[PDB]
Each structure stands twice: as C-alpha cells, then as structure tokens.
C-alpha cells in the first residue's frame, strides 16, 4: 500500500491510495515479466457468510481512505495513508490534529498515533508517554510493551490566502514533498 498526492495550477487535486496488499503482495513475480502480484483477495473474510465473504467477481474490502477536505465547496486538504486496516485510524487522527487541535500540518502527521480494532489488538507510535501508557493499561487497555510506526501520511494543504500549496510526507518512510514554481 502506498499513498501519494498531487495538486496543479488549474485547481486539480489528486489523493491516491494504491496497493498490492502485503509487501510484495503474494510475493509472486510473474516469471519473465518482473511484475509482483497482489494477494488483495485475502482482504476477504475467511469464514464465509458475511458481507465480506469471497464471491466470484467481487472486489475484496479495502481500508484505503484517500480523502479531500473542503472549506466552502473548495478543496483545502488532501489526506491518505497506508498501513492496512489502520489506515482509517491514521487519516482520522491526522484530520483531528489539523482541524480540532489546529496543529501545524506536519505536526498533525508526526503526532503519535494509536490504532486498536478490538479489545485484543492495540498498536501505538513511539511518543506516547510511559506514565500514560501505564495508566491506560490499568484502565483496561493492552498497549504493547514496545511501539510501532503506524501509517505513512502524505498530505497537501491548499493555501488560498497566501496562494500557495504546502505538501508534507510522513517520516515513517522516506517520503518527499516538492513544489513547482513557473
């Protein structure tokens, strides 16, 4: 999974999350083509009978969440992560940090995340203070004894008032942002 974003001079905005599932997908390289093959179908639930059971021709459920935020019918921010099922959580938390805490955009991204999808699954980015982790786990949570990097947000903010764009890449990977002038 990767996410990448582009904005141009005619007001087009691209938020694009794209993947082959697991790293290298299935692992399979189409022989004499070099192409790595997805295992995307394993996003399907195993035990059948649900809404996300396997069916012929069915696209298996994704967690990809390419997003654009708009202020007054006009796009202002672009957000998207990879990280499997944690993507939802990453984007949501970025958005919080940017609009609810009014953080600088980079600060929004770099602010430690948590993810947890049941009472049995917790993950956290380094940065959550120990006293805090300890107090959470007393209360009934299961934050592991060591942290993990969650997601990789790239995002582009569109600055009307200064007529510019800001772009930022999460440090979780070696992402990079580069503007264009003229």
């Amino acid at each position: 999974t990767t996410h990448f974003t582009v904005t141009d001079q005619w007001g087009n905005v691209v938020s694009y999350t794209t993947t082959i599932e697991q790293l290298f997908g299935t692992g399979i390289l189409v022989p004499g083509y070099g192409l790595f093959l997805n295992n995307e179908l394993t996003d399907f639930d195993a035990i059948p009978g649900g809404a996300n059971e396997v069916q012929p021709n069915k696209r298996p459920l994704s967690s990809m969440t390419p997003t654009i935020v708009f202020k007054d019918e006009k796009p202002v921010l672009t957000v998207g992560s990879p990280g499997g099922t944690t993507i939802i959580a990453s984007v949501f938390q970025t958005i919080l940090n940017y609009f609810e805490y009014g953080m600088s955009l980079q600060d929004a991204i770099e602010e430690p995340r948590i993810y947890t999808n049941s009472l049995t699954s917790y993950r956290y980015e380094s940065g959550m203070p120990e006293d805090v982790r300890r107090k959470l786990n007393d209360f009934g949570h299961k934050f592991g004894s060591n942290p993990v990097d969650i997601g990789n947000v790239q995002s582009i903010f569109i600055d009307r008032e200064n007529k510019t764009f800001m772009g930022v890449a999460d440090s979780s990977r070696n992402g990079t942002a580069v503007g264009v002038n003229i």
């Binding site: 582009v6 904005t7 141009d8 001079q9 790239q154 764009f165 440090s171 070696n174 990079t176 580069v178």
Partner: peptide, 26 residues
C-alpha cells in the same frame, strides 16, 4: 526534503525518486 511549498504545483510521494518525477510532469 520532507516539507515544501509551491505556487504552480505540488507533489508529495512515498519515495523521493517518484516525486521528483511527477514534478517534472508539472
């Protein structure tokens, strides 16, 4: 470089040798 500013375009990608290439297009 992890942050940056642009007037006539912008691009932010997971890999510096992808970015970088999009920028050339713009």
């Amino acid at each position: 470089d992890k942050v940056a500013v642009g007037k006539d375009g912008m691009v932010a990608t997971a890999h510096p040798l992808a970015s970088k290439i999009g920028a050339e297009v713009l």
